[PDB]
Amino acid sequence: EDGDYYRKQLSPLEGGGWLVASGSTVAMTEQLQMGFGITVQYGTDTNSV
Amino acid sequence: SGTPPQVYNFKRLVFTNCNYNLTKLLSLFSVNDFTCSQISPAAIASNCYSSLILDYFSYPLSMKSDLSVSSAGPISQFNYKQSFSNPTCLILATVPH
Amino acid sequence: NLTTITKPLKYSYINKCSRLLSDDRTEVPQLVNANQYSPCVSIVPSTVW
Amino acid sequence: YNITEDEILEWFGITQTAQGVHLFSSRYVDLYGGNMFQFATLPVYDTIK
Numbered sequence: 168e169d170g171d172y173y174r175k176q177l178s179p180l181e182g183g184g185w186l187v188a189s190g191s192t193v194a195m196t197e198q199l200q201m202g203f204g205i206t207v208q209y210g211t212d213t214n215s216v
Numbered sequence: 217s218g219t220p221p222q223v224y225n226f227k228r229l230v231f232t233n234c235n236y237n238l239t240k241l242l243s244l245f246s247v248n249d250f251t252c253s254q255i256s257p258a259a260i261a262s263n264c265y266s267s268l269i270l271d272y273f274s275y276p277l278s279m280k281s282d283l284s285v286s287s288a289g290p291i292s293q294f295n296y297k298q299s300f301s302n303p304t305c306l307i308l309a310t311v312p313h
Numbered sequence: 314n315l316t317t318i319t320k321p322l323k324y325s326y327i328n329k330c331s332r333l334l335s336d337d338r339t340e341v342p343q344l345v346n347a348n349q350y351s352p353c354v355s356i357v358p359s360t361v362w
Numbered sequence: 363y364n365i366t367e368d369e370i371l372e373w374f375g376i377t378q379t380a381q382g383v384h385l386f387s388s389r390y391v392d393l394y395g396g397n398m399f400q401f402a403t404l405p406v407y408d409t410i411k
């Protein structure tokens with residue numbers, strides 16, 4: 168549901184305390200809309216994409 | 217194939233040394249938003265690249281403006297940020313009938 | 314013991330210069346010649362801020 | 363620059379070189395023939411295109 172509170176315990180080596188978050192929801196529209204993030208690189212790998 | 221995840225649990229596919237063709241992929245796409253940050257949108261499938269990392273997720277067109285790096289909303293804060301030093305692209309599509 | 318020559322505000326140069334075409338995926342290289350000037354200087358002012 | 367007037371055929375030469383812009387005229391000596399000798403070398407900064 169909208170604005171669900173999610174919490175977890177973090178070890179003091181990683182920083183400690185409690186990690187908290189809120190997950191909001193934008194409801195489904197009449198049709199599914201999906202998102203693509205595209206990132207191309209020119210020097211990381213072999214130039215064969 | 218399968219349920220597209222959300223914008224913070226984006227599904228990563230890395231492609232390298234394989235053949236890709238958007239004309240066989242965009243031919244089944246009812247794309248609404250077609251933008252590309254720091255790079256051209258039109259020539260994305262044209263030139264040859266070393267690597268292509270594509271994260272696909274479920275994203276409505278109602279929340280479209282948070283996609284940008286310059287946005288200060290939840291998406292650029294905690295969900296997904298695109299590469300500044302690498303060419304990037306934001307495509308919001310809708311399922312065809 | 315000399316005042317006819319003066320000093321600039323601060324030193325400056327270029328750390329990145331190349332050309333981009335209309336397709337905007339491929340980079341065209343630029344190179345300086347013997348005491349010459351790349352066209353990147355044409356848009357850079359007298360002193361980089 | 364000065365020149366005289368005539369009804370005799372003539373030539374003029376333009377080129378660019380790293381020292382400057384060379385201007386060639388046969389009106390100085392070879393009025394009756396015609397072949398290109400330098401009279402001017404303009405102090406240009408870069409190479410025109």
Ligand SMILES: *[C@@H]1O[C@H](CO)[C@@H](O[C@@H]2O[C@H](CO)[C@@H](O[C@@H]3O[C@H](CO)[C@@H](O)[C@H](O[C@H]4O[C@H](CO)[C@@H](O)[C@H](O)[C@@H]4O)[C@@H]3O)[C@H](O)[C@H]2NC(C)=O)[C@H](O)[C@H]1NC(C)=O
Pocket residue numbers: 368369370371394395
């Ligand atoms: C256009 O009108 C002009 C007049 O404005 C007219 O010019 C005349 O041309 C003749 C032919 O060249 C000239 O006669 C010359 O006389 C000198 C001595 O004063 C000679 O040294 C010349 O010989 C030269 O040419 C030889 C080849 O033809 C070379 O081998 C030689 O080494 C010399 O360089 C030549 O006999 C005449 O003096 C001028 N007159 C004037 C008033 O300038 C010209 O003929 C008309 N027509 C054309 C097509 O230009």
